[PDB]
Design a protein around this ligand. Structure first.
Ligand SMILES: *[C@@H]1O[C@H](CO)[C@@H](O[C@@H]2O[C@H](CO)[C@@H](O[C@@H]3O[C@H](CO)[C@@H](O)[C@H](O[C@H]4O[C@H](CO)[C@@H](O)[C@H](O)[C@@H]4O[C@H]4O[C@H](CO)[C@@H](O)[C@H](O)[C@@H]4O)[C@@H]3O)[C@H](O)[C@H]2NC(C)=O)[C@H](O)[C@H]1NC(C)=O
Ligand SMILES: *[C@@H]1O[C@H](CO)[C@@H](O[C@@H]2O[C@H](CO)[C@@H](O)[C@H](O)[C@H]2NC(C)=O)[C@H](O)[C@H]1NC(C)=O
Ligand SMILES: *[C@@H]1O[C@H](CO)[C@@H](O[C@@H]2O[C@H](CO)[C@@H](O)[C@H](O)[C@H]2NC(C)=O)[C@H](O)[C@H]1NC(C)=O
Ligand SMILES: *[C@@H]1O[C@H](CO)[C@@H](O[C@@H]2O[C@H](CO)[C@@H](O)[C@H](O)[C@H]2NC(C)=O)[C@H](O)[C@H]1NC(C)=O
Ligand SMILES: *[C@@H]1O[C@H](CO)[C@@H](O[C@@H]2O[C@H](CO)[C@@H](O)[C@H](O)[C@H]2NC(C)=O)[C@H](O)[C@H]1NC(C)=O
Ligand SMILES: *[C@@H]1O[C@H](CO)[C@@H](O[C@@H]2O[C@H](CO)[C@@H](O)[C@H](O)[C@H]2NC(C)=O)[C@H](O)[C@H]1NC(C)=O
Ligand SMILES: *[C@@H]1O[C@H](CO)[C@@H](O[C@@H]2O[C@H](CO)[C@@H](O)[C@H](O)[C@H]2NC(C)=O)[C@H](O)[C@H]1NC(C)=O
Ligand SMILES: *[C@@H]1O[C@H](CO)[C@@H](O[C@@H]2O[C@H](CO)[C@@H](O)[C@H](O)[C@H]2NC(C)=O)[C@H](O)[C@H]1NC(C)=O
Ligand code: NAG
Ligand code: NAG
Ligand code: NAG
Ligand code: NAG
Ligand code: NAG
Ligand code: NAG
Ligand code: NAG
Ligand code: NAG
Lengths: 728, 189, 728
């Protein structure tokens, strides 16, 4: 009859989700790139104007990957020759184009293979990292001043992170922090000398007759971790004749007694910077607030201006300690910390004093602080309807904490329940981006009266296009396990019948502080499986999941692969007990941590699941990196936690794999979860005598994301699933 | 006349011997001797200026390589490095230089164990190139100052007037002795 | 019905053939191992005595792997702590036990991690290689003498071969050749300084946090090859106060003009050695016969005594030039060389004369020379019945070449057509080992009258066991292609009916000079398939195969991947035309070179084959070692043969794989055919969109010979074949 969401539709991306990506250049203007040229929009009443034209982009011979606009609007930074390295890191060539003279700046150019470039928040100061060294350009045409001279490849990193910091700590390649008005440039230096390297073979293009070995400094669980130093340089004193001087800011005395991390850098004022330090045993953190001393030229860090965050029941933060949001004068700040009951909420701090006053409370969590103003604070929370999966924007008076108003709860209640926000420079205009149960909707608002200005994008065309096709429906509900609610989502096939019985596939991540059950509209592999193959795809949020308090998230502390596995198995049992699930046909699949949970579920010997797919799975926690593993498990030493490091392993349970059908997939050039982990799973399975299926992917990273590789892997897993359920 | 030049500097190898053509014979007292044998005029018979000519060829030469230089020998030395000529009366010396002399030792002793020419349908015919009693070696140009390590193989494309094939030479290395042993031939005319 | 040959019968090895492995220690005596004892036997009368007892082995704390006998019988050499490295190389610990004194020798023992140990041909001299250096013990209790001082790991090899030599040139790890009575020790020195290294990862046991990288000097096609030198040392002049003197023997100038190999070392007399050198273009070879001069203590090779062996239509030899067999005086020898027609026959040589005379003629080939006594020469050939896959023992009279007598043609005609022999020390008694169409049979004969003494092994127990098993049958016949007979074999299911149609699996190797159609009894995977699954397993000998003449064998020259593939396809077409073969269910499988041919056949787009399995296949000929590849293809340079090197890849044919089902298997720790080849095949197949099945085997070499991995791979391949043929 009618068309359905097919695999080609997912792989070829026939149905496109339109987005409205804008960059707020000013308090009431933003840049939008439509029809391959940048336009300026007035936030009040439309009033669009052309900023750059397509012909200008046609001028230079090479293709432009990305552009960056100087805050004064006089220069643009054109990025080309893009070459990706890791999830957040790359190298590229950059060209500077004058917007007033309308010409290229050909003298004293930024060198090729530049690792990172950034503008100052005001003016047109330019700082970039080249060969692990920092250079600062006061003007785009004048020569650059070299800041650091100790940059060494794979040894010393200046202004950029190493692998582990970029992956787990900062979630970014940049370790540069400009001052609020561009006077000081703070940077971190990472030393990876004694950090051991992971080596894997890179079978490059077919013309290469000898494979290359990629050596990456990678601290595994319990190994030497990279070491860090923090420096602040003064860019107004830079002179050509002399070398620049960098003033080092040391970690607190309570933090130098062992291994530590630098987890956050924030500028409080033009002469005040806050640093957060985290111990290797990541249940202790200290915030250091330091003030510039004009006579000395040095930065003084007072002991009385130190704030300590502790966690008796687990780790500090969700993945890291949260960032502070200082006031205009810089004498106080707002931070999201866990309350006495375990729910993260905004607490009001004063830099001099230890005690903090909580301004929000309840059985819900604050997701983040969005904007701070003299009169109001804006934040995202899941308070509405008591659903942990939803997100909404709120505002709270700073003179009266009782008056709290929801700015997005009733705008379109049915279609939008998952909100995100972008605020202008002075926070008088914001864009609300919903991606709730309905199609994504983008709107513009003004903060003065919280009135709706216009609709930037409503995804009308997809709605027109999706009327012909047969779409599945998402149901979000909860179950009671032990006097507590755990939320699940199910992708029900079209014309779902409660009397009929369907196969069930469990989509699993089940990592610490994760949410696989939310109100987000997605067009993915589950849409195909529900729309075309009539398979129910279900996800569960059990113990160790986030955004529902610390009693649930910290339940898997030092015990990884124990409670989440049993929670997934019990969820599958409850789903089969619900009534419309075929007990003979139940499957489970996951990626990364989800692959680990899938493997442990299959090796548990419960008999609930018929088959499973693990994609790039973690097999042993001693093979994974130190920061992530030691956040949740501790150190792999006989003193504290070696016993559970040995117990929680997929290999140990290889004898229970006889009762299931297993698909094991891994990319050979994976740097996050190395191929060694699957290679050990397969070796254990072969040693026991288990029949299973495997597939490697040459030169493929953690996310097996090419065109051909992505299409191939999803076609292969669709074939496996159709063979499992005996589908036509 | 003056025999200072032979004494100064680094002595040459056997295959790259140096000849001085000019009496005295006091210099034999300078270093210890071992073999004064002759085939023509007997040793200790010097005519001073009555000799029409006096030629000497000298070269660093180990004493272990002694049986390979004789009136009649079948070895690498005679075949490819140095064969004595008996048209004129000559006298071998094979003396050993002492210490504290103006003689810088060579790094090692060297000689050529093979030196032939290759030319055929598919480079098949091998022709060893035996040297004349009075001529130098064709394979001299390969490392005239000696070889580094043992069993080096040298090759070059011979041009016309030399045969037009491929010249292959193999050299041998013997480590230097504590004191420098050298070799002389004195032909009187 | 009755029992059949099952998969567990093959994997657990339920039915086992028995062997009679003996070591002739004398003209009339040999040693045999039974009941964990060492029994010496009298060949003339058959009585035995206990050479070594049970209790002698039990006094050692270690488990003895192998034993060695001094030619005088005074010392045993017991090998333990076995550690395998490559196909032929290993390290072990050795201890010497005196048989007269009945005690272990504890003074100056052979060091641990000894690479190779060998006795002298007479007496009890020992030469062993430790740390890439050669040591010689004149007596087992006296200290050893260091022969070489230049040994270095992965750089310089003394007395032992490097990977490419051990794999392709010598098929052995030793590079030591004792003099006929042990006065001289000849050895080769290899130099791998500029040879590039192949790097792959070795995961090891699960307790290892970081995988190891294995660096093996491996010269690929066109890369820098190792350098070889040859030395002879006099072991009678060894002293404890002077270093041993080794006299170098240089190659002929016809090889010194470029790259070359050392192919064979054979002693003619006590003071004569023969050396065979091959050019990198392996169609030119020279044998050098060198003599020892006692005046100089030097070895001299005359130019007149050099023997040229060249090939115009291909390469020299079957794989390497054949070994000479000198007479007692050492002034003449017999060699197997190709005649004008193209058939390998024994030619009689004089050391100093260039012309040699052929003593055998025919449209058949001599396989090898087995013994050379006065007035008689013993050899193995496939002359009998015109069957290229049979082997029979013949003797020829040196006084009259017209008197040729087959010593095994009419011994047991139905049961025995494939013969191997082992002669005594003076060729007075020979053991005839048969492995023909029937069960293997071992008999002892005396050469004075060619009379049979006794039957050493009858395999009567296996015959009794196999009467209750439905066993498969083998048919050996030929087909005519362009007026040329090409032979094939067929493992037929029990109760074979020509009227019925059967699925057909084509087992292929098709390498140069290969024979897959012979009269050899086997119990392998094909027995199970034919006995249990009723699948016809066929092998075909096409163009490029051996033992049929140079016209058939050299058709593959410089055209690898062209004629063998077409011959396999045409053979499949003929098989389907025979009338008992299901045309829809035809499959092809192979290992190593067979995997390459299978992949080429599947990418040919012929449509004959439904599916295929490739195990450790060659993908690109530039990824393989230089010796093997350049024997058949040449250098990969634009002047010589790069275009075929580019046209003969499995990758180029990735588009045609959409019409077949593919199973691709490799072991990650493979050092012969690296994992890079299968990785490149899989990468090409993903790019074009082809769905296939893959399986990697962790830590598994080319053989995949570990018991668990062997069982796993054959179970997986059986599952795949059953699925392809829709077998219930
Ligand atoms: C295993 O193989 C490797 C690689 O093939 C071997 O290593 C090579 O060893 C050779 C030595 O034969 C070496 O070549 C020398 O390198 C020196 C440093 O680069 C050069 O200086 C030297 O040239 C001089 O010697 C030549 C004679 O060998 C002369 O012909 C030449 O003109 C140069 O002359 C200098 O020296 C003389 C004194 O001898 C002096 O009077 C002159 O004035 C002048 O100064 C050689 O080219 C290679 O560089 C090595 N290659 C490497 C290391 O990669 C290794 O030896 C092999 N191992 C074994 C055990 O055989
Ligand atoms: C990076 O770290 C290494 C080691 O952690 C530092 O090297 C040490 O330098 C000190 C000098 O102060 C020596 O005493 C140590 O012996 C060195 N250790 C090692 C292992 O080399 C190195 O100086 C650091 N680099 C920077 C730029 O800080
Ligand atoms: C700035 O510092 C760098 C490195 O500390 C100086 O560069 C060194 O200069 C010395 C003396 O000229 C050289 O011996 C080194 O080789 C240089 N090192 C490098 C990495 O370049 C540089 O001279 C300093 N500049 C000034 C103006 O003092
Ligand atoms: C950016 O901020 C810095 C820090 O407040 C300013 O630098 C100070 O400026 C005042 C007034 O000009 C001087 O008295 C101080 O000596 C300066 N201190 C330092 C460390 O430079 C700077 O002027 C600001 N720039 C702009 C453009 O506002
Ligand atoms: C952070 O975690 C560590 C490890 O769990 C805690 O150290 C433990 O402290 C208790 C109480 O003093 C001891 O009984 C344990 O023996 C300690 N374990 C180890 C491995 O040393 C530490 O107390 C925690 N810190 C905070 C602030 O909660
Ligand atoms: C035999 O040769 C070896 C190496 O060629 C000699 O060992 C060397 O001896 C010298 C002086 O005693 C040392 O400086 C070297 O370090 C030694 N090398 C090695 C590798 O050991 C040994 O002395 C020689 N033996 C005799 C008797 O001459
Ligand atoms: C092993 O063979 C060698 C080589 O023929 C024999 O050595 C020769 O023996 C004869 C007689 O004793 C001497 O005249 C030669 O000078 C020896 N040559 C060398 C190179 O040593 C040796 O005698 C044989 N050993 C046996 C038969 O036990
Ligand atoms: C070994 O094979 C090479 C390569 O096929 C032969 O070299 C060829 O020789 C013929 C005739 O002289 C020339 O026409 C070709 O151009 C040569 N090819 C190359 C690549 O040089 C060589 O002759 C053969 N050696 C024999 C038969 O002894
Ligand atoms: C649009 O914005 C420009 C400034 O960018 C302003 O000059 C103009 O008046 C605006 N148009 C209106 C208000 O209609
Ligand atoms: C500018 O060029 C692009 C081509 O990349 C085109 O799509 C766009 O329509 C052009 N702009 C205008 C205003 O025509
Ligand atoms: C970057 O590389 C290109 C191409 O080699 C070259 O033309 C250009 O000058 C380089 N840029 C710099 C800053 O050197
Ligand atoms: C690991 O499992 C063993 C049983 O095999 C148990 O004795 C031990 O207590 C466990 N350790 C843990 C759960 O930390
Ligand atoms: C030697 O031991 C084996 C088993 O250990 C036994 O079968 C055999 O009979 C023993 N030998 C003798 C002569 O008893
Ligand atoms: C076999 O018996 C004969 C006697 O006929 C004897 O000479 C021979 O040594 C015996 N063989 C063994 C191995 O005992
Ligand atoms: C070999 O190793 C063992 C164990 O360390 C040791 O006892 C023995 O002495 C070693 N052998 C030699 C010859 O050193
Ligand atoms: C092999 O491919 C090359 C590349 O185009 C071509 O030049 C050559 O003719 C091809 N060879 C054959 C036999 O088709």
């Amino acid at each position: 009859s009618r068309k359905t969401y097919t695999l080609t539709d997912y792989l070829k991306n026939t149905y496109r989700l339109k987005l409205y990506s804008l960059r707020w250049i000013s308090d009431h203007e933003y840049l939008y790139k439509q029809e391959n040229n940048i336009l300026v929009f007035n936030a009040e009443y439309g009033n669009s104007s052309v900023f750059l034209e397509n012909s200008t982009f046609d001028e230079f011979g090479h293709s432009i990957n990305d552009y960056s606009i100087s805050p004064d609007g006089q220069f643009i930074l054109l990025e080309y020759n893009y070459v990706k390295q890791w999830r957040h890191s790359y190298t590229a060539s950059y060209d500077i184009y004058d917007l007033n003279k309308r010409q290229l700046i050909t003298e004293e150019r930024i060198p090729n293979n530049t690792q990172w470039v950034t503008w100052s928040p005001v003016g047109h100061k330019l700082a970039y990292v080249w060969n692990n060294d920092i250079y600062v350009k006061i003007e785009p045409n004048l020569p650059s001043y070299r800041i650091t001279w100790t940059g060494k490849e794979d040894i010393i990193y200046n202004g950029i992170t190493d692998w582990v910091y970029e992956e787990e700590v900062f979630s970014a390649y940049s370790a540069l922090w400009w001052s609020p008005n561009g006077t000081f440039l703070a940077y971190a230096q990472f030393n990876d000398t004694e950090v051991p390297l992971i080596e894997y073979s890179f079978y490059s293009d077919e013309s290469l007759q000898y494979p290359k070995t990629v050596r990456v400094p990678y601290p595994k669980a319990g190994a030497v971790n990279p070491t860090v130093k923090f420096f602040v340089v003064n860019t107004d004193s830079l002179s050509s004749v002399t070398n620049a001087t960098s003033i080092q800011i040391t970690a607190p005395a309570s933090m130098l007694i062992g291994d530590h991390y630098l987890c956050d850098v924030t500028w409080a004022t033009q002469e005040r910077i806050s640093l957060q330090w985290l111990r290797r045993i990541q249940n202790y953190s200290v915030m250091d607030i330091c003030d510039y001393d004009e006579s000395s030229g040095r930065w003084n860090c007072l002991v009385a201006r130190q704030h300590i965050e502790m966690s008796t029941t687990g780790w500090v933060g969700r993945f890291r300690p949260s960032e502070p949001h200082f006031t205009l004068d810089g004498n106080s700040f707002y931070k999201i910390i866990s309350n006495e009951e375990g729910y993260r909420h905004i607490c009001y701090f004063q830099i001099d004093k230890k005690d903090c006053t909580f301004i929000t409370k309840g059985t819900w969590e604050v997701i983040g602080i969005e904007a701070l103003t003299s009169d109001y604070l804006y934040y995202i929370s899941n308070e509405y309807k008591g659903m942990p999966g939803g997100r909404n924007l709120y505002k709270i008076q700073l003179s009266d904490y009782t008056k709290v108003t929801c700015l997005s709860c009733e705008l379109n209640p049915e279609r939008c329940q998952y909100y995100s926000v972008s605020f202008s420079k002075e926070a008088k205009y914001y864009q609300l981006r919903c991606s709730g149960p309905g199609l994504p909707l983008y709107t513009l608002h003004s903060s003065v009266n919280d009135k709706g200005l216009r609709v930037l994008e409503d995804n009308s065309a997809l709605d027109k296009m999706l009327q012909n096709v047969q779409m599945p429906s998402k149901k979000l509900d909860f179950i009671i396990l032990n006097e507590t609610k755990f939320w699940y989502q199910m992708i029900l096939p079209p014309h779902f019948d409660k009397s009929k019985k369907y196969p069930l596939l469990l989509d699993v991540y089940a990592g610490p502080c994760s949410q696989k059950a939310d109100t987000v509209f997605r067009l993915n592999w589950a849409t195909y499986l529900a729309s075309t193959e009539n398979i129910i795809v279900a996800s569960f949020d059990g113990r160790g999941s986030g955004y529902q308090g610390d009693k649930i998230m910290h339940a898997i502390n030092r015990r990884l692969g124990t409670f989440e596995v049993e929670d997934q198995i019990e969820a599958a049992r409850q789903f089969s007990k619900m009534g419309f699930v075929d007990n003979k046909r139940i499957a489970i699949w996951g990626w990364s941590y989800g692959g680990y949970v899938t493997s442990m579920v299959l090796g548990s010997g419960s008999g609930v699941f018929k088959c499973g797919i693990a994609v790039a799975p973690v097999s042993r926690w001693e093979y994974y990196d130190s920061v992530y593993t030691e956040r949740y498990m501790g150190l792999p030493t006989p003193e504290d936690n070696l016993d559970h490091y040995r117990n929680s392993t997929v290999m140990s349970r290889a004898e229970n794999f006889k009762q299931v059908e297993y698909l094991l997939i891994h990319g050979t050039a994976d740097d996050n979860v190395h191929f060694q982990q699957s290679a050990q799973i397969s070796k254990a399975l072969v040693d026991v005598g288990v029949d299973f299926q495997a597939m490697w992917y040459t030169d493929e990273d953690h996310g097996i994301a090419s065109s051909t590789a992505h299409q191939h892997i999803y076609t292969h897993m669709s074939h496996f699933i159709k063979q499992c359920f005996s589908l036509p | 006349c003056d025999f200072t030049p032979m004494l100064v500097g680094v002595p040459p190898q056997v295959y790259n011997f140096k000849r001085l053509v000019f009496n005295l014979t006091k210099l034999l007292s300078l270093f210890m001797v071992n073999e004064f044998s002759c085939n023509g005029i007997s040793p200790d018979a010097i005519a001073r200026g009555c000799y029409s000519s006096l030629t000497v060829d000298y070269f660093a030469y180990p004493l272990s390589m002694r049986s390979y230089i004789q009136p009649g020998s079948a070895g690498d030395i005679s075949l490819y490095n140095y064969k004595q000529s008996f048209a004129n009366p000559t006298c071998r010396v094979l003396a050993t230089a002492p210490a504290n002399l103006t003689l810088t030792k060579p790094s090692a002793y060297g000689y050529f164990q093979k030196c032939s020419r290759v030319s055929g349908e598919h480079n098949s015919v091998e022709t060893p190139l035996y040297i004349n009693p009075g001529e130098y070696s064709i394979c001299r140009s390969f490392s005239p100052y000696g070889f580094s390590e043992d069993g080096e193989v040298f090759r070059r494309q011979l041009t016309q007037y030399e045969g037009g094939g491929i010249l292959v030479g193999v050299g041998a290395k013997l480590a230097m002795t504590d004191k420098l042993e050298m070799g002389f031939i004195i032909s009187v005319q």
